[PDB]
């Protein structure tokens with residue numbers, strides 16, 4: 001038909017591609033529903049693209065590569081990080097076929113511990129997309145919660161500041177509302193100021209949430225140690241390995257320390273790689 005769960009992600013770098021395979025394995029280990037992964041093709045390495053049919057056949061999922069060219073009229077991003085962020089949030093209406101009703105962005109560095117079909121079924125109450133809020137539970141990190149003071153605290157008027165690591169998009173609704181055209185136009189005007197949209201993929205939906213509604217997802221949908229308490233980890237449906245501005249601990253060290261099953265997925269994918277080589 002089109003798959004019960006449709007997930008898209010973006011990865012640039014061998015480290016993020018290594019975590020992307022782990023994310024996919026974690027999704028498949030926690031669901032019996034049909035899954036299809038969608039990749040932002042141009043950022044991937046030839047090795048990753050060659051290995052994906054092996055992952056698909058081992059884990060039992062479908063996949064599709066999407067190559068969408070940045071429109072010439074639309075203000076470009078010279079920083080590759082920001083261009084990749086642009087691909088997460090600016091083209092939700094054109095990356096996928098009109099037959100696809102819903103897609104979920106899951107970060108390449110995520111670890112899933114839930115049946116992702118529960119996010120497909122989560123009620124959005126008319127919102128074109130749903131994001132989890134940033135945690136307030138780790139009190140020692142309050143000084144780094146930039147959204148709780150200054151510009152964002154005044155702008156939000158008590159509304160949540162949502163993390164862009166995970167989000168469900170009701171593509172039927174998002175198209176119904178022309179949210180794509182509206183997000184591109186707002187981004188084009190806002191980005192004329194190079195100081196605006198510092199966290200492009202995160203700031204844009206948070207900025208537009210008064211006119212393009214966000215269904216604030218349950219806090220358990222996204223857990224990051226930087227913002228979220230140790231006590232809420234047991235409830236976490238998905239983990240994001242977000243940067244800790246206080247410790248600056250490396251990415252792989254965060255993965256191994258925080259997530260016990262991380263090495264299990266990593267070793268399982270490396271075992272599959274050696275099996276394919278024979």
Ligand SMILES: O=c1ccn([C@@H]2O[C@H](COP(=O)(O)OP(=O)(O)O[C@H]3O[C@H](CO)[C@@H](O)[C@H](O)[C@H]3F)[C@@H](O)[C@H]2O)c(=O)[nH]1
Pocket residue numbers: 010011012013016081085107108109164165166199201202240241242243244
């Ligand atoms: O595929 C990739 C991704 C990153 N990097 C680079 O890794 C660095 C760290 O960024 P990363 O995306 O991992 O941060 P993270 O804290 O998970 O992001 C959150 O915050 C981000 C917004 O600030 C949000 O997009 C994200 O979902 C949140 F988890 C940074 O220099 C990126 O350019 C890369 O080389 N390749």
Ligand SMILES: *[C@@H]1O[C@H](CO)[C@@H](O)[C@H](O)[C@H]1NC(C)=O
Pocket residue numbers: 029030031032115
């Ligand atoms: C898939 O179905 C089997 C049926 O025996 C069940 O035991 C298993 O726990 C299910 N897995 C998931 C992730 O739902």
Ligand SMILES: [Ca+2]
Pocket residue numbers: 107108109110165240241242
């Ligand atoms: Ca991340």
